[PDB]
């Protein structure tokens, strides 16, 4: 399925080349511009654990998730990955725990040492 495919066929987008964050572009977005550091970014997403269970979804909440890019307001894989996206892009990200929740995990449903799968849509970005 899609997690296996990004694991085996994804591109390493880490600056250290440690394969901690792998990406596939699923829907090509608009133009060439990506957000810059500090921009307000608006995403839709769904996340799954490596046991197959959904752990989160903005679609199910009927509202996007909004954060300022490159500020550590989200897991490292998201700061790194969303920074590569175009407006309108949909991607898959495969995130090793060092770029996610590490040994701590995150209650209620993310265990320790968890590799995570996300589908992310970059809806919009704007400077403040």
Notable traits:
7 strands, Chitinase A, domain 3, 128 residues, globular, 34% strand, mainly beta
Count of spatially separate domains: 1
**Main beta sheet strand tally, sense and closure:** 7 strands, antiparallel
What is the straight-line distance between the termini? 39 Å
CATH fold-level topology: Chitinase A, domain 3
Derived from helix and strand composition plus strand pairing, the structural class reads: mainly beta
CATH class: Alpha Beta
Based on Cα principal axes, name the global outline. globular
* CATH architecture call: Roll
Beta-strand percentage range? 25-35%
Element order: H for helix, E for strand:
HEEEEEHEE
Helix content: 10-25%
State the total count of DSSP E strands.
7
Helix count, per DSSP? Answer: 2
Radius of gyration equals 14 Å
PDB class: isomerase
Keywords: Fk-506 binding domain, Hsp90 cochaperone, immunophiline, peptidyl-prolyl isomerase, isomerase
Assembly: monomeric
Entry title: Fk1 domain mutant A19T of FKBP51, crystal form IV
How would you characterize the overall build of this protein?
With 128 residues, the chain is mainly beta. It has a single domain, classed as Chitinase A, domain 3, CATH 3.10.50.40. Helices cover 12% and strands 34% of the residues. It contains two helices and seven strands; from the N terminus they run αβββββαββ. The protein has helices at 2-9, 76-82, and strands at residues 11-12, 21-27, 40-49, 54-57, 65-68, 90-95, 116-126. Strands 1, 2, 3, 4, 5, 6 and 7 form a seven-stranded antiparallel β-sheet that branches.
